[PDB]
């Protein structure tokens, strides 16, 4: 199973590796190649949002109707994301101790 | 009646299903989707970002 997700940084849902953390690259000498870290232990991540009213339907032609943001009921809160602290800390620590094999 | 972080009202006018009349409708567009035109400090006549 291959899930065609779209993400720039911090790879979302997909197959994991085995044994330990693995690092892939092209040359490992120049700075122009994007280096890829494949983990072994997953880290949970959640993202939320405040409320919206509905899809306000605006008609601009014979059948061509679009949906815009309507009202907002309640207070205004900022859409945030949450990651556990110690799991991310020891995951980045494992990334560092395994990346230290290529840099003495 | 309050302060929002990144939204603007942006009420405009648009053509209905009949190619005679135009009606005023409102929305709530985000701040990165809204770009001001002209050069002056009149912060009223905004526009959509991908219409350029």
């Amino acid at each position, epitope marked *: 199973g291959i899930r065609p997700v779209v993400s720039t940084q911090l790879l979302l849902n997909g197959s994991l590796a085995e044994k330990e953390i693995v690092i892939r690259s092209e040359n490992l000498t120049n700075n122009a190649k994007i280096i890829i870290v494949h983990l072994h232990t997953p880290v949970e991540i959640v993202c939320t949002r405040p409320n919206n009213n509905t899809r306000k339907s605006v008609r601009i032609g014979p059948g061509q109707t679009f949906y815009a943001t309507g009202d907002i009921i309640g207070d205004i*809160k900022q859409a945030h994301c949450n990651i556990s602290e110690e799991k991310w800390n020891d995951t980045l620590q494992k990334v560092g101790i395994e990346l230290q094999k290529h840099f003495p | *009646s309050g302060g929002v972080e990144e939204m603007k009202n942006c009420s405009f006018n648009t053509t209905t299903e009949i190619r005679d009349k135009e009606k005023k409708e409102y929305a709530l567009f985000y701040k990165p989707d809204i770009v001001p035109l002209s050069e002056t400090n009149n912060t009223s006549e905004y526009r959509l970002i991908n219409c350029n």
Partner: antibody
Framework: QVQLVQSGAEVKKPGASVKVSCKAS????????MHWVRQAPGQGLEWMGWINPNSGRTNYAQKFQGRVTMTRDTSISTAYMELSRLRSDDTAVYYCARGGWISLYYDSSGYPNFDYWGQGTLVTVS | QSALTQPASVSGSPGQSITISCTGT?????????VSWYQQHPGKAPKLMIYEVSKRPSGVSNRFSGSKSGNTASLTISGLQAEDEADYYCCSYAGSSTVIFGGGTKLTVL
């Protein structure tokens, strides 16, 4: 210990406007909500809208839109209610209460955790 | 979208348990677990009894117990004394940032 002080009793006539002020002392009122209730003598409690003093956002209940306005004042730590077009059944007592905690991460406006209440203002008409 | 259903008045001798219940619409009480009770002494401001369906705040002894079942929220008192001559009010979050209050019960000590 924190306290909530209110204004005095008012005697008015129909077709006027009434202003009720509630002042909180002893705690940072900017990080807490403020709710309003009205009590006529004889029946139960009724709920009016809430004010967010950190941003001034209002959301009144049903059958009250357009005639009641709420305004915070962060300089002297007060909250004002201006209610216009009074009727004969508006003779009541008004209470201000402290709602939930403003967290900037989840909508905690509708939480009915009213901990501290005021003495209330007795308004009447004839 | 009226007030919550609640009986007129209750009665009971001291020394036993009295159960009060409030019923409402499924979108009001049956959907969210945000209900609470208020004790109204005649003459001054009321005081909150329990926070959530079952959550005891400080300053009140372990004597009130709250529960929810289906569309009915119940509050139980055990060991009645003479310091309960006050009204009782239910309240619930009704969605869209609006709180719906109840009718009210009066308890008498025989």
């Amino acid at each position: 210990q924190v306290q909530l002080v209110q204004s005095g009793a008012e005697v008015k006539k129909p077709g006027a406007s009434v202003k009720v002020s509630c002042k909180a002392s002893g705690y940072t009122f900017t990080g807490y909500y403020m709710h309003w209730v009205r009590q006529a003598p004889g029946q139960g409690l009724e709920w009016m809208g809430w004010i967010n003093p950190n941003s001034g956002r209002t959301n009144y209940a049903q059958k009250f839109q357009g005639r009641v306005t709420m305004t915070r004042d962060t300089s002297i730590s007060t909250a004002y209610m201006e209610l216009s077009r009074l009727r004969s059944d508006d003779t009541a007592v008004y209470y201000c209460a402290r709602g939930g905690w403003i967290s900037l991460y989840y909508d905690s406006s509708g939480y009915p955790n009213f901990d501290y209440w005021g003495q209330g203002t007795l308004v009447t008409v004839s | 979208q009226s007030a919550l259903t609640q009986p007129a008045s209750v009665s009971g001798s001291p020394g036993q348990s009295i159960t009060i219940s409030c019923t409402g619409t499924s979108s009001d009480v049956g959907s969210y677990n945000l209900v609470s009770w208020y004790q109204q002494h005649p003459g001054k401001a009321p005081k909150l009894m329990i926070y959530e369906v079952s959550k005891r705040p400080s300053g009140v002894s372990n004597r009130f117990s709250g529960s929810k079942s289906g569309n009915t929220a119940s509050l139980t008192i055990s060991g009645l004394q003479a310091e309960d001559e006050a009204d009782y009010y239910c309240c619930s979050y009704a969605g869209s940032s609006t709180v719906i209050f109840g009718g009210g019960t009066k308890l008498t000590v025989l």
